[PDB]
Amino acid sequence: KMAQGKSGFRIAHAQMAVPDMKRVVVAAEKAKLLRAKIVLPKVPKRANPLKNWA
Amino acid sequence: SLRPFVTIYDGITGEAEKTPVRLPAVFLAPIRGDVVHFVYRNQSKNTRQPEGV
Amino acid sequence: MKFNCKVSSNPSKARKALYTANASQRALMMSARLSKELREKYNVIAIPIHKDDEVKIIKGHQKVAGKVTAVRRSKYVINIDKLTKTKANGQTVPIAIRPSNVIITKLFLNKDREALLAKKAESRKSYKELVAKRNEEVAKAFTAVYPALNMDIFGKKVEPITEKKPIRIPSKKMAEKLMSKPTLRAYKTGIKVHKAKNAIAAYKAALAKK
Amino acid sequence: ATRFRQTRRRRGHVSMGYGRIGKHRKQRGGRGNAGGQHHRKTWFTTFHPDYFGKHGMRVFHLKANKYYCPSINVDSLWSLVGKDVQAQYKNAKVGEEVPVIDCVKHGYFKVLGKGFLPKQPVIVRARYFSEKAQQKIKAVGGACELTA
Amino acid sequence: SKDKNRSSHNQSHKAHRNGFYKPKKSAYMSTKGMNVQVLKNTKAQRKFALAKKLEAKKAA
Amino acid sequence: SAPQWFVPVKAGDAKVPAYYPTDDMIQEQKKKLRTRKGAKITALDKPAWN
Amino acid sequence: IKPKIVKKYTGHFKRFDSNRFLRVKASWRVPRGIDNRLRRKFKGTNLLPKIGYGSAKATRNMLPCGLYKFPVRNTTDLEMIMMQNRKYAAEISHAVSAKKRQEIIQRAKILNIRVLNADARIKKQEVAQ
Amino acid sequence: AVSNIHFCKDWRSKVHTWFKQPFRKIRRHQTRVEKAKAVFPATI
Amino acid sequence: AIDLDRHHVRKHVSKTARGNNAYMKLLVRLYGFLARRTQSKFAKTILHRLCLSRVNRPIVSTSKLACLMKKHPEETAVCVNTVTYDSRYPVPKMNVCALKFTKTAEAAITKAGGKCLRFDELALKAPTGRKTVLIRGKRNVREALKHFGKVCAKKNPAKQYKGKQTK
RNA sequence: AAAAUGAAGACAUUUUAACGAGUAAGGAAACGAAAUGGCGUAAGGACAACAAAAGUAGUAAAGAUUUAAAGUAAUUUAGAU
RNA sequence: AUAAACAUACUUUGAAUCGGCCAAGUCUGGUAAGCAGGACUGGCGAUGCGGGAUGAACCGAACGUCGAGAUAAAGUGCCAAA
RNA sequence: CGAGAAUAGAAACUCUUGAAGAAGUAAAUUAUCUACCCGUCUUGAAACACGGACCAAGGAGUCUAACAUGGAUGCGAAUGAGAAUAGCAGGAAAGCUAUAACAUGAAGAGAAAACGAAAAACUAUGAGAGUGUAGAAAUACAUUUAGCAAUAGUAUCUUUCAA
RNA sequence: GGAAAACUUAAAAGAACUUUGGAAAAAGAGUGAAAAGAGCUUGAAAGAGUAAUAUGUGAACGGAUAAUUUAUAAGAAAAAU
């Protein structure tokens, strides 16, 4: 409804309806659309195969 | 748009009024800090008095 | 707050008007409070000080009593015979005292202080009847809305409201995202601090129960 | 906001961002539009190629109120009354009432023909009409009315 | 106060920083100023194909 | 229980907050600085790994 | 437990020509002169601040005692670092009186928080006491 | 854009500031009120 | 040293919502998570378009939504921009997801029987994008683009910023 | 630069790789994975002991002179007089 | 064939600059010039470092703060490391 | 003799120095190495080129008006209407309200008279969405659909002697 | 034409008497919370004086590295079965 004491002014809608990110996350997890969380593998240090037998 | 009920208290006796009042829709407006900063930066200069050497 | 446009709230203009005040207006500034015995007899709070008026010092190093020997309106001070200092070579000189640091104990009333002390008495009574008239109308209005109550409840202890009804508003979820970084880190620090204070009190209570 | 200017980021640099060889002097080629045909000619040629000269006839005391003629196309006619009024009279024809879209009251004096009209009859009243505007109004089943 | 007149020194180095901008493909596809009869033949066919297409679009 | 960071100490009859426990329920703990175990003892006839 | 704090340059970066003129203070200013000896990094005078001198991020802003600094103005300020007494250290501000300093020092001992001004503004109990 | 600014004359003595605008409102309103008090349908 | 063609400078792509709008920042987080986890080109497209500036996010009117959705009846238009109302032409029934709906545009879609979703509801219903029709508005219709260039040019002259004595 | 993680930790997140000279000149503010990061002077509006006495101050402010510490630096911090 | 996704194509806005100087298995005027003027490239200007004793341009090589190691130009009677 | 693979195997330490001052840091002096006067115009200055004896304080891209681009913002065929001005509470150079003249825009061409836009478009490439198979970890191939932005080219339409 | 020059203290209580001196003054004494002592709130830099310490053949100053001197400055726990 347009304001009566403020001609031409109406309360705006936020850029998002429910400003919460959790309900979308649980919907895709329920729908099996999300990959599993990733922990970066420990990158091995450079070695010298000409001397390091291992 | 349920707009939950809001209780009205008595200032003298402290007893809450039996009839709650719905939450006005102005309390569901987007909370924009940037837009307020734009307006407050301007209107805060409107009380200033002219000066000059 | 002051609402009169003729008077000024400027400290610089207040001091200047004080230093350039003529002798007529310098006497009213030099006023001292009457003592308990004199206040009950005349029903007057304070009158401008006078010569030969006996006073008692209430603020300063020496709280002696004496007779006012000099009223100096240019310096805005007075002199007491008792309070004196020897001027090195042997002669003594009076010590100035602000009139607001003394209270009058004995009056010098020739013929005009009778006029003044009477006039300042009716003024006190006439204002009390004005305050009384206004205070009864406020009471008359308050009871007209709260007949079971009395106006005396305002002068007593107040019992706060203990009910804690919460309201569900879909903005409490964003409250931390509407904070600037400087004020969010202060809000969260106060939360963490309070929890530590609340955790110690819980631990202390277990030992007290033990 | 003088704290956000470039002067605050150039405190310490000698020339204040204007060069050492070519200093910042008083003038850079004149005062105003000087040299419109001598040393700024390549500027006026590039960016205002018809700045110099004369064209057209002089009107000694022009009457700009006589050329005032707001215009509206046919596709924008029904907005003058609203989409709710348009749907109300959608299924009208010749014989019964049809809304009259007067345009002078709304401030439009001429009606032009651009875009399309809803397939409904209508009575368009205005001061001037276009040749293609009247065709589109009559083809949809409406009428054209003059005013003043 | 004689000065040096002209030099090409450092002009090829400057020209190859943001190097020779080749024209796009649309520059070679312009047909302004082509044969008059060839343009007439092409336009005649395009108007024939377009009208047939729009007639079919009207049927469906 | 006590927070892992909270090591209560006796207050010398000084001013303490309402949440801080009083002296009668505080038992001081000796400061511990040695966290590495000493060397083991093996048979006299066997040689050390080192 | 305390790591090894390594400083890449322990000296002071003094302004150029500050040792010859008293009007040129010792606070550093990058020389912008077109002929400046220092800004051209001549041999002998090529010591300017760089990001390369920055100390390790882990051991940055860390006092020699192994802790950080947390200024306090009253007793309630101490309550913000009682969970991190192994990480921070109280540092009473310079304007805090001697009467208030005792309350902070007395409370900080209760909360096991180190104070770096423990002998600040003390009374005259140094001779004949 | 070819600039057209007529500032080559003395504009500093041609400047008129509206600092009296908030006080004109009070002044005119007080006269409108005083007119009705004097003879009411004179301000009619 | 090393002889490179050029030195590494900041890449000229935005990776976050511009400005301090708390809700637009939340949307970027929501779709930054979806693009990273679902690894879908659609969520990458929405995430990329949410970070464009206002000038690069042009409006789309109900007239263009009506025409683009004509042969897509059971579909949801997805335009990352404001949606204005073309008062000249009727609004059919359609479900549209957009950053903002004009007061007159939302009432025209709602009355016709459509739905005006936002970008959180779309992520709840079609997160990877299944009944979506990606739509963006025209960029070359800006009045600024007319004046760019040299108006003395022989092929595509500019439009001559008006000023003193512009006949 | 790319991967990973992400309502709040904290060091302006974690990992890997490449890179780092410079006059004139440019890089305004804001922008959670931040479209360079900061220090200093003064003035205005708020915040500063969350249990009803709520930043420091005659148990010594500002300033000054020095001794040490933090920061690559701009500077900051504290002791003594 | 080879190389190229922080590739490629750009768009907009704008700064400073158009006194230049040097080298050469190059040229023209001049007896010649550390003279005057050009073609191609690399430099100095805007640039420190190691070497040529010293040097705007030569030789090696272009610079975040450092530790260790092979090296470059060039050196190895003393100054001076060999 | 023997790789793979299966079965059994084992590393937890010493000495010295330090509140009689350890490690580090600072200041002063000495020794080796190293170091030309700053700012400025200039192709080139440490220059026999100019300013500078020394210290403190002051000291130089500011304001007003018009236009454009660009980053954040509101509204959107509208935007503004703190145009004057008229009211409200409160006493207020602040705040709020005013179906409003007008400004920019929605339509463009022509010197002007006189005019004033659809074949409800076409072509090319292009953003997204599925399905199957496989490697097999990610990911790669085949197929169905969609055709936004942008660029180019077109048919058609308004105005002009001329697009 | 046209300057420069603000400030003791809460209160003058603005030292008051002796000795030396031609005098000005100085040394005591005294007032004051404090000389803040009238050239009076604080009291910077340039320039001097005194005291302590160090250095030395035609400039001086700065940087890296060590040596000497001085200063700062790290602890009260505790082993094996």
Side-chain angles (χ1 to χ4, degrees), chain A, chain B, chain C, chain D, chain E, chain F, chain G, chain H, chain I residues 1-164 166-167:
Chain A
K1 269 161 295 148
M2 286 254 291
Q4 296 297 299
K6 313 212 147 205
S7 161
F9 168 69
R10 199 183 87 171
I11 285 161
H13 301 238
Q15 253 74 23
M16 46 200 312
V18 174
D20 168 77
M21 197 195 147
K22 195 82 131 189
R23 76 185 185 131
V24 176
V25 171
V26 312
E29 285 209 350
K30 263 171 51 46
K32 291 299 297 168
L33 302 192
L34 298 178
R35 81 152 137 77
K37 261 187 47 153
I38 304 193
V39 176
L40 288 167
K42 198 269 189 196
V43 200
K45 283 280 197 330
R46 202 247 327 168
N48 202 0
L50 313 179
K51 287 168 200 184
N52 195 3
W53 176 249
Chain B
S1 82
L2 200 38
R3 306 230 309 261
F5 280 112
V6 159
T7 325
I8 295 165
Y9 299 94
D10 199 305
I12 311 294
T13 84
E15 142 175 341
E17 187 162 59
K18 336 183 160 74
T19 319
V21 158
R22 295 283 205 194
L23 186 91
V26 71
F27 294 99
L28 315 176
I31 294 177
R32 300 279 314 271
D34 36 312
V35 180
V36 171
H37 189 283
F38 188 101
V39 183
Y40 188 79
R41 171 174 41 155
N42 283 37
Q43 283 232 332
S44 36
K45 304 187 198 136
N46 286 8
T47 65
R48 287 194 308 193
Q49 203 154 128
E51 314 276 352
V53 302
Chain C
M1 184 74 222
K2 176 255 310 169
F3 294 127
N4 198 11
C5 41
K6 298 183 174 304
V7 302
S8 177
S9 96
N10 194 34
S12 291
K13 281 184 191 125
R15 281 181 230 109
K16 163 109 167 306
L18 184 80
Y19 293 151
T20 65
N22 41 20
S24 325
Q25 318 164 90
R26 286 177 125 101
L28 295 175
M29 284 147 207
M30 310 202 42
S31 289
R33 242 180 172 191
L34 285 184
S35 64
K36 268 172 47 53
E37 294 84 2
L38 288 179
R39 189 202 269 207
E40 296 159 336
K41 168 165 205 178
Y42 303 106
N43 306 123
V44 177
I45 299 294
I47 56 163
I49 220 173
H50 200 284
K51 219 201 200 293
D52 313 59
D53 267 15
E54 300 226 359
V55 296
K56 145 100 188 160
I57 304 168
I58 62 171
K59 288 157 201 313
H61 200 32
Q62 340 189 36
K63 335 283 211 71
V64 297
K67 177 164 297 293
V68 168
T69 81
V71 171
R72 331 197 56 150
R73 298 167 176 175
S74 43
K75 307 297 302 142
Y76 274 126
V77 301
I78 66 166
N79 278 345
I80 306 307
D81 63 58
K82 293 273 293 315
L83 214 82
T84 43
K85 198 163 185 319
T86 84
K87 197 206 136 48
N89 53 61
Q91 67 153 210
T92 82
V93 276
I95 289 177
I97 302 160
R98 324 294 310 210
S100 95
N101 300 338
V102 314
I103 69 167
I104 311 163
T105 67
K106 203 200 150 275
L107 284 186
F108 171 84
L109 41 107
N110 40 86
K111 198 173 89 192
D112 305 21
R113 293 210 137 173
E114 313 305 86
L116 182 78
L117 289 170
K119 180 217 182 308
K120 274 162 151 293
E122 314 154 34
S123 316
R124 286 253 304 168
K125 301 194 100 79
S126 313
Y127 183 73
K128 288 248 186 66
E129 89 210 358
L130 203 91
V131 158
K133 210 168 298 322
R134 292 170 179 173
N135 288 15
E136 79 145 303
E137 143 75 1
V138 163
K140 188 142 32 74
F142 162 72
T143 284
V145 193
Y146 290 94
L149 294 166
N150 200 10
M151 261 280 313
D152 70 354
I153 64 160
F154 302 113
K156 296 185 299 205
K157 206 233 163 193
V158 191
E159 313 286 345
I161 290 172
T162 328
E163 209 274 327
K164 285 293 271 172
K165 209 171 321 291
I167 301 307
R168 184 127 54 77
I169 302 168
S171 316
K172 300 171 168 37
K173 333 176 299 302
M174 286 285 276
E176 283 185 359
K177 292 157 202 174
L178 315 161
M179 277 146 165
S180 90
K181 302 320 151 198
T183 177
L184 156 78
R185 302 263 59 76
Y187 161 80
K188 295 280 257 177
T189 298
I191 277 189
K192 174 166 78 68
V193 163
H194 221 71
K195 282 195 218 112
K197 292 203 267 165
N198 289 292
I200 297 168
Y203 160 79
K204 151 177 189 162
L207 294 202
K209 186 176 47 58
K210 166 149 314 300
Chain D
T2 206
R3 51 179 209 280
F4 297 151
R5 252 82 173 247
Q6 204 195 142
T7 165
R8 322 299 331 168
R9 305 180 269 130
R10 293 279 112 76
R11 284 262 163 267
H13 313 70
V14 185
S15 39
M16 271 282 280
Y18 286 95
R20 310 200 99 125
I21 302 160
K23 296 100 182 138
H24 181 199
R25 289 278 160 78
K26 305 294 304 205
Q27 297 309 322
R28 235 163 56 154
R31 246 168 194 212
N33 322 316
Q37 335 204 68
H38 306 277
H39 60 291
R40 270 133 172 199
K41 191 188 196 164
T42 74
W43 193 82
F44 284 92
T45 280
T46 316
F47 299 122
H48 300 288
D50 59 336
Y51 180 67
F52 294 106
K54 283 196 214 194
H55 208 96
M57 20 183 279
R58 300 167 293 143
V59 195
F60 287 153
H61 43 100
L62 180 67
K63 308 191 160 290
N65 266 354
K66 163 183 99 47
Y67 302 100
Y68 189 76
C69 192
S71 319
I72 179 140
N73 298 280
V74 285
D75 59 352
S76 324
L77 269 170
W78 276 102
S79 62
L80 295 196
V81 298
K83 288 253 165 112
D84 81 272
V85 171
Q86 168 188 350
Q88 182 172 18
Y89 297 95
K90 150 171 44 61
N91 278 334
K93 33 96 178 189
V94 59
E96 71 275 58
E97 297 269 318
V98 175
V100 166
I101 303 185
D102 90 341
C103 325
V104 193
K105 175 211 301 195
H106 298 81
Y108 306 97
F109 295 167
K110 197 187 181 134
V111 181
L112 304 165
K114 179 206 182 186
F116 331 101
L117 268 162
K119 270 135 159 87
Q120 318 156 218
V122 74
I123 306 163
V124 189
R125 155 185 326 168
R127 260 158 196 197
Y128 319 92
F129 275 93
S130 157
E131 208 208 29
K132 229 181 288 311
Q134 187 198 271
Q135 290 186 29
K136 297 194 198 229
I137 297 176
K138 283 190 162 178
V140 88
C144 288
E145 284 182 342
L146 292 174
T147 328
Chain E
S1 90
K2 262 165 83 187
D3 65 302
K4 301 284 233 164
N5 297 287
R6 178 216 144 260
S7 199
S8 277
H9 176 258
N10 208 71
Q11 288 330 302
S12 209
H13 163 261
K14 269 216 315 187
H16 278 97
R17 303 307 304 277
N18 319 332
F20 293 113
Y21 295 127
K22 312 170 320 168
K24 299 302 206 326
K25 201 80 155 36
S26 83
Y28 305 98
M29 268 154 204
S30 179
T31 186
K32 290 199 125 304
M34 254 186 176
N35 201 315
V36 182
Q37 185 54 74
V38 151
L39 282 196
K40 274 201 291 270
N41 300 349
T42 296
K43 169 174 214 154
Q45 199 270 327
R46 291 223 188 93
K47 251 164 120 173
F48 175 76
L50 176 54
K52 160 182 311 304
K53 174 154 302 162
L54 304 195
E55 140 205 345
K57 216 184 50 183
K58 177 179 318 297
Chain F
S1 188
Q4 283 95 50
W5 51 265
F6 183 64
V7 188
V9 318
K10 284 285 209 321
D13 288 340
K15 205 216 173 306
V16 288
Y19 64 83
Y20 194 73
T22 78
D23 287 286
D24 73 298
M25 71 275 288
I26 288 166
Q27 319 281 355
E28 290 276 57
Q29 249 300 325
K30 156 71 56 187
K31 161 197 283 222
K32 166 218 312 153
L33 301 175
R34 168 119 200 188
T35 201
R36 159 196 97 268
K37 58 197 321 166
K40 80 197 300 314
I41 307 292
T42 61
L44 196 41
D45 69 339
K46 86 172 315 216
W49 80 273
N50 211 16
Chain G
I1 46 184
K2 165 189 127 72
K4 315 201 171 183
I5 313 167
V6 176
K7 324 295 206 97
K8 283 163 186 165
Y9 186 79
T10 333
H12 271 254
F13 289 99
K14 285 174 276 184
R15 190 171 158 178
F16 188 63
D17 259 30
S18 55
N19 55 305
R20 306 202 167 137
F21 306 90
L22 328 172
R23 55 179 191 242
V24 183
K25 280 137 202 141
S27 79
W28 169 257
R29 304 262 169 285
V30 50
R32 305 223 151 78
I34 68 187
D35 277 327
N36 198 281
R37 182 166 324 271
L38 179 49
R39 79 146 267 269
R40 303 208 264 142
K41 288 156 222 189
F42 278 7
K43 186 185 178 164
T45 68
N46 45 16
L47 186 81
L48 316 108
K50 310 221 96 67
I51 218 70
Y53 286 96
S55 44
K57 275 218 274 168
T59 74
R60 195 141 75 200
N61 289 109
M62 171 162 332
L63 304 155
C65 37
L67 311 171
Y68 296 89
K69 208 175 62 57
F70 188 86
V72 303
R73 291 221 212 163
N74 42 44
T75 41
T76 322
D77 277 24
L78 283 162
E79 301 177 5
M80 297 172 192
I81 50 161
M82 54 198 220
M83 331 70 177
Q84 306 142 6
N85 39 314
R86 330 272 324 166
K87 181 199 193 273
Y88 281 119
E91 169 114 1
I92 327 176
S93 281
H94 68 281
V96 195
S97 47
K99 172 164 185 161
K100 190 160 261 194
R101 267 170 218 254
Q102 296 324 103
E103 318 310 306
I104 303 168
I105 288 177
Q106 203 164 230
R107 175 79 54 87
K109 183 179 58 50
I110 287 322
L111 293 174
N112 229 26
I113 296 159
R114 195 184 304 218
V115 183
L116 315 174
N117 303 4
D119 199 329
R121 264 188 208 213
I122 215 67
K123 223 47 78 177
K124 303 260 146 142
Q125 281 92 67
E126 298 111 16
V127 53
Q129 205 75 280
Chain H
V2 173
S3 201
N4 210 22
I5 291 185
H6 298 40
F7 264 28
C8 311
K9 291 153 109 140
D10 179 26
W11 66 269
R12 254 180 276 111
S13 46
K14 292 309 173 176
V15 157
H16 190 19
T17 39
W18 289 52
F19 301 135
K20 325 197 174 208
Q21 190 203 358
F23 302 91
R24 204 152 41 231
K25 235 197 192 160
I26 303 153
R27 189 151 39 68
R28 284 159 164 174
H29 180 95
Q30 178 57 31
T31 322
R32 268 195 290 285
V33 163
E34 277 187 293
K35 200 178 168 199
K37 275 191 163 183
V39 284
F40 209 111
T43 177
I44 220 162
Chain I
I2 196 139
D3 173 41
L4 316 157
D5 317 68
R6 82 193 37 79
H7 273 91
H8 300 325
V9 216
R10 154 196 97 91
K11 186 170 287 200
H12 277 252
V13 180
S14 178
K15 301 158 296 170
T16 167
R18 335 194 86 115
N20 263 349
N21 188 10
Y23 303 94
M24 272 285 308
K25 283 289 191 192
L26 199 49
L27 275 182
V28 156
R29 280 281 226 100
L30 170 61
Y31 274 98
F33 168 86
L34 268 161
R36 162 159 29 93
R37 295 288 282 273
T38 53
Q39 303 276 19
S40 78
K41 290 194 263 143
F42 176 87
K44 291 229 174 69
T45 278
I46 297 295
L47 164 70
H48 177 95
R49 294 186 191 181
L50 272 170
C51 308
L52 298 201
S53 68
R54 175 165 141 159
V55 131
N56 290 305
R57 277 194 274 99
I59 63 181
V60 187
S61 75
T62 73
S63 274
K64 223 221 194 165
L65 289 164
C67 302
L68 283 177
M69 292 293 287
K70 194 153 290 315
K71 34 214 301 198
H72 294 131
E74 291 315 327
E75 281 275 28
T76 291
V78 180
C79 36
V80 201
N81 46 47
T82 311
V83 167
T84 74
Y85 173 47
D86 188 5
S87 56
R88 305 167 305 181
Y89 304 126
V91 183
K93 160 180 113 40
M94 48 211 185
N95 325 289
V96 190
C97 161
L99 277 196
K100 194 169 132 185
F101 285 89
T102 302
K103 299 197 280 265
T104 67
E106 201 151 12
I109 303 180
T110 280
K111 163 157 279 176
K115 276 163 57 50
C116 293
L117 323 164
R118 264 85 193 157
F119 263 103
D120 63 65
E121 311 156 20
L122 174 100
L124 202 73
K125 154 160 81 172
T128 72
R130 269 203 168 262
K131 304 307 274 302
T132 69
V133 185
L134 276 173
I135 293 175
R136 34 178 165 171
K138 309 207 77 65
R139 277 204 209 184
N140 56 14
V141 308
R142 218 150 46 94
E143 97 187 337
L145 298 213
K146 315 286 279 179
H147 304 285
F148 290 165
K150 327 222 281 191
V151 63
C152 83
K154 283 197 292 261
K155 287 305 279 187
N156 283 117
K159 208 41 81 170
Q160 217 250 32
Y161 296 120
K162 73 178 285 293
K164 164 193 173 168
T166 305
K167 72 179 83 142

